[PDB]
Design a protein around this ligand. Structure first.
Ligand SMILES: */C=C/C1=C(C)C(=O)N/C1=C\C1=NC(=C\c2[nH]c(/C=C3/NC(=O)C(C=C)=C3C)c(C)c2CCC(=O)O)/C(CCC(=O)O)=C1C
Ligand SMILES: */C=C/C1=C(C)C(=O)N/C1=C\C1=NC(=C\c2[nH]c(/C=C3/NC(=O)C(C=C)=C3C)c(C)c2CCC(=O)O)/C(CCC(=O)O)=C1C
Lengths: 615, 628
């Protein structure tokens, strides 16, 4: 079901049991020693020759001329914190030093790996100053560039590259140093699947991975199976683990002969590698390996710092945006002038290329954006089914295929609403990121770069959880201040209605203000009181028809006003007693809403006594 | 008492009986005859030697001796009321031709003033090309100036002055034209007291007045009292009637020695005179008087035309104002725009030097005007009691002494309300009228009481003009108060509609804003300053329990909120002091204090020390919390 270790082609190389290769590389020996017994129950086949011993398989370390058992025994104790642990020990008829690495796999026993010791170290600082250059690295690029130059120096490898992984798992050759006379892969990219997950877990677990020679003949582990009725020993943590041929082939295809890959984990997750490649075999001494791990933890630390600092910039942004909306505007009344840069680009916190804002059926944009009709259709998508509070896609085209056409400038969009309205939000865009089965023999970096391109088809850079979080706090700041702003503006409008309104009420003349359909909204006293005081109660300009010399001249004039929107200027009589009482002047006018439908009408009278002059 | 003719001094000559002189000027003779029999019952004592006769008193007119009777008969048919009328005749021993003037006073019989015709009777290129210039005249200034040159030219007289009279009846030498060697009177002014009412009637009535020689000895009427009244003869309409020595002693003091004074009557009222003075005695023949009369009537017309037209422009100004205000800002904002400059002056319609708008409590001026506090002060003064459509004074101190100090700029004020609020007016000002002229008509060297007719004069009358007229502005005329009313009335009507529209607009700009706040999924209340609840969205109402004791005022809303009546201590600290907050809170319900909500209470500000209201915009679980 899952390919045996050195037995898989590309249709299944992802699932390779790379942890259960029953063999090792020949620059060290491997011993698996039993619990209590402390009796070699399983050993690499080069053990005797390599360690200059005779009988090994089935011999307690108590024997094995030397000093191994005594040099490892402190670490098998309640006292210590377990292992992995490295020892320095002597082994032989006459004796030789070795650097031992022992760790316990889940069942199996102790695995002890031995390599031949190297000369001393001194340097001496080298660590101190390099290490503070990591700390001072002004920026992710300045850092990496320096990590690469720095490792190139520390380990004389022909080339070193630091890769960065994206949320997708795809790699990018983020920096690179290489001696003259070689290709340069600086800038390359490669599919997430070029480094299978199981590998990656190991890259997290043990932070250094050495291939001394691409053509090594793997020395098989002996009594292959575990005799503690286990089976294929779990080499998850064996420094001397054989490598998958798939990768071995890759490396031959590149011309590379040796490898040293020290991983970078940042926030407990695997951020990328520092891959040192040599075009002649090569081997770094355990001590120099220790140094490397330190750099990887130092480098990482800065990487975490630099992230944090970015979060700093963003936090500040939203702050200065909130302050900017309250101040800059809303005191100059309304808040949109703050949204756009002029100086503080709302683009940076998402590292987007354009931004659009749709509010009260109006769009304004900054940067590379699609087209108002396009921006509308996206708006449609977001609205057609709830959810909310920040939404994204890095492949709009392939997420809703009718929209595809807008892939060159908005493969990726992030949209955060600013009110519970619908059709009201802030949305950011990114271009198609692409502006920057076979067999085991066909693999290469140019074959990997293309293919990366095949995947990543209609996609933008993905939205980093950092990005999305910025989208959340901005949209959330914006809405909060926009909602307080709308509540307050209601209150002011209330005060402005009341008032204005009173002024009409204070008029000695009769006025009636009505709405577009003709129903009375306001009727001051002056008017009310002239209706021979004593019922009925008018809801519509029609209802008033009777109080004026009966007249369907009022209806009809009112008709003109309601239907047709044209006002009038004439007189009306008004009924009461002897010689049909006093006549008032009237003058109704519409108040425009848009142009085709009105808002309402105001009919003020009045000049009781026939006097504009007249004529 | 009213001093019988030639016995007046400065104290009582405003009533001198000048229509009852008892005299005649020598240049003619006057005969009073009886009806229907025609006998000379009265005659100026020169009647005899003047007319070449032996006797006149007592004798009938047929016996006379010179076609006079014949020459009058066609004018006495009581069908054709010809009178007054001019006749031509011969009379006496050697026959001399006389120009007669007939007329019939209500009292004693029928007057016949004859004077000695002495002319060719000339052609008249003099009339028709004059009337041209007159119907032509563009402005009052042009008409008057020309009328002056024109008289100066027909009559040879040394000085023509057209005088205008203002509403007080004060005189202005509104235009003048004279001769090398003369003091210029041009801008001068004078009291109404200078030319007394009775004397104003004599001019309104009899339209030409002549004095041939100021020294001249009066001729008495014999018997003097009219034999059919026992009283005096109403000489009100006698071309030879003598002249108060008051006004004589004046001309005397000016160096003038003759006068010809044709009257300008507009719309049945004396608008001014055309005064023709001269510095040696003058005679002027009848036909030339006849020309002057015709000239006066032509001008009187023009003058009516001119006002008629000024008026029509006043009207148009107002019609443009209406629109200048309509477009004029309503379609670009407000309206006040139009009232203000806009190179169409709100000052001109009232020949005012300043204007002031006070509205909605703010005040804006233009033109010469008093301080802004002062204007509030005037507006206060205006607001003491109900006024009536337009209000005015031309004497602000004097009428309202509390405001004496405003005299300079606003000795005159006119104001028309533009709403029914009070405090809302449009008002125009005019200065103490002393500050016009600026001709040294009153340096500082008194004076006062007069006196002695030996003191009379221009200097002195110009000065007397200042003494009267002191806390005074040129009067508001009927056109001025005409203007005010219209302008105001229009300003008002546009203001009131405008006010009824923002009320509608302003309403929709609220439903809509409330609907939005409604729209929000978060609970939120907007309250007034005294804590009453105005808005409470369904996203709030729906977090309250079943029965829901409706609700008014925040305080009685801490019933929910796990008592924590520090909600109340918070609400009051917010209302009483105006202190919003940002704490937490915990709502109750099903079943035991499970729903905690964030609250943000914020004051909205009226005044800048008192507050319009509050927004308790809560509102959320704790899914916002808080770093990132
Ligand atoms: C199906 C399995 C694999 C395919 C196909 C493949 O390409 N690699 C596969 C498995 C493993 N890869 C391992 C290490 C590894 N692979 C890459 C891929 C690259 N592609 C590129 O274009 C470039 C540079 C231009 C690289 C480096 C890299 C970078 C690495 C890391 C080691 C190195 O950089 O040399 C791997 C692990 C072997 C081990 O156990 O050490 C497996 C398995
Ligand atoms: C109280 C009696 C009078 C006082 C005092 C007085 O000043 N005038 C009085 C009476 C009459 N005036 C008559 C004619 C007349 N009076 C004036 C006034 C003037 N004031 C001026 O300041 C100037 C010049 C600067 C004048 C002329 C005027 C203007 C006139 C017009 C006639 C003219 O200009 O000659 C009058 C009757 C005259 C008559 O009997 O025909 C009386 C009486």
């Amino acid at each position: 079901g899952s390919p045996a270790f050195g037995t898989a082609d590309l249709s299944n190389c992802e699932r390779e049991e790379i942890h259960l290769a029953g063999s090792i590389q020949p620059h060290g020996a491997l011993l698996v020693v039993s619990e209590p017994d402390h009796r070699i129950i399983q050993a690499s086949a080069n053990a005797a020759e390599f360690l200059n011993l005779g009988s090994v398989l089935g011999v307690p370390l108590a024997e094995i001329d030397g000093d191994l058992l005594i040099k490892i025994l402190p670490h098998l104790d309640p006292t210590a914190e377990g292992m992995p642990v490295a020892v320095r020990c002597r082994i032989g008829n006459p004796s030789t030093e070795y650097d031992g690495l022992m760790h316990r796999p889940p069942e199996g026993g102790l695995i002890i790996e031995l390599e031949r010791a190297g000369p001393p170290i001194d340097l001496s600082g080298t660590l101190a100053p390099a290490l503070e250059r990591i700390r001072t690295a002004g920026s992710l690029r300045a850092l990496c560039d320096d990590t690469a130059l720095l490792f190139q120096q520390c380990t004389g490898y022909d080339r070193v590259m630091v890769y960065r992984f994206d949320e997708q798992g795809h790699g990018e050759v983020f920096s690179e140093r290489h001696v003259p006379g070689l290709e340069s892969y600086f800038g390359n990219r490669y599919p997430s699947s070029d480094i299978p997950q199981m590998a990656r877990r190991l890259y997290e677990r043990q932070r250094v991975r050495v291939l001394v020679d691409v053509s090594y003949q793997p020395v098989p582990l002996e009594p292959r199976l575990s005799p503690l009725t286990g089976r294929d020993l779990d080499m998850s943590g064996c420094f001397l683990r054989s490598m998958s041929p798939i990768h071995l082939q890759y490396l031959k295809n590149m011309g590379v002969r040796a490898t040293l890959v020290v991983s970078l984990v940042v926030g407990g997750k695997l951020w990328g590698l520092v891959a040192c490649h040599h075009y002649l075999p090569r081997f770094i001494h355990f001590e120099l390996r220790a140094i490397c791990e330190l750099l990887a933890e130092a480098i990482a630390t800065r990487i975490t710092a630099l992230e944090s600092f970015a979060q700093s910039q963003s936090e500040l942004f939203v702050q200065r945006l909130e302050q900017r909306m309250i101040e800059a505007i809303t005191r100059e009344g309304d808040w949109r002038a703050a949204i756009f840069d002029t100086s503080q680009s709302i683009l940076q916190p998402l590292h987007a290329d354009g931004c659009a804002l749709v509010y009260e059926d109006q769009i304004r944009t900054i940067g590379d954006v699609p087209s108002t009709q396009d921006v509308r259709e996206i708006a449609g998508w977001l609205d057609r089914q709830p959810r909310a509070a920040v939404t994204s896609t890095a492949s709009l085209g392939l997420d809703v295929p009718e929209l595809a056409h807008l892939t060159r400038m908005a493969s990726g969009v992030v949209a955060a609403p600013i009110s519970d309205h619908r059709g009201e939000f802030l949305m950011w865009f990114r271009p198609e990121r692409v502006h920057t089965g076979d067999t085991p023999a066909d693999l290469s970096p140019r074959r990997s770069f293309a293919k990366w391109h095949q995947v990543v088809e209609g996609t933008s850079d993905p939205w980093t959880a950092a990005d999305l979080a910025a989208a959340r706090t901005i949209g959330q700041t914006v809405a909060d201040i926009v909602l307080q702003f709308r509540a307050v503006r209601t209150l002011i409008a209330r005060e402005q209605y009341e008032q204005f309104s009173s002024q009409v009420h204070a008029s000695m003349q009769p006025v009636l203000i009505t709405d577009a359909e003709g129903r009375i909204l306001l009727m001051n006293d002056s008017f009310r009181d002239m209706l021979p005081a004593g019922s009925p109660s008018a809801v519509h300009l029609d209802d008033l028809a009777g109080f004026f010399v009966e007249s369907n001249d009022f209806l009809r004039n009112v008709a003109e006003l309601i239907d047709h929107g044209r006002g009038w200027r004439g007189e009306v009589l008004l009924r009461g007693a002897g010689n049909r009482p006093l006549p008032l002047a009237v003058r109704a006018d519409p108040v425009t809403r848009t142009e085709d439908q009105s808002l309402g009408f105001v009919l003020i009278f009045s000049d009781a006594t026939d006097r504009r002059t007249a004529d």
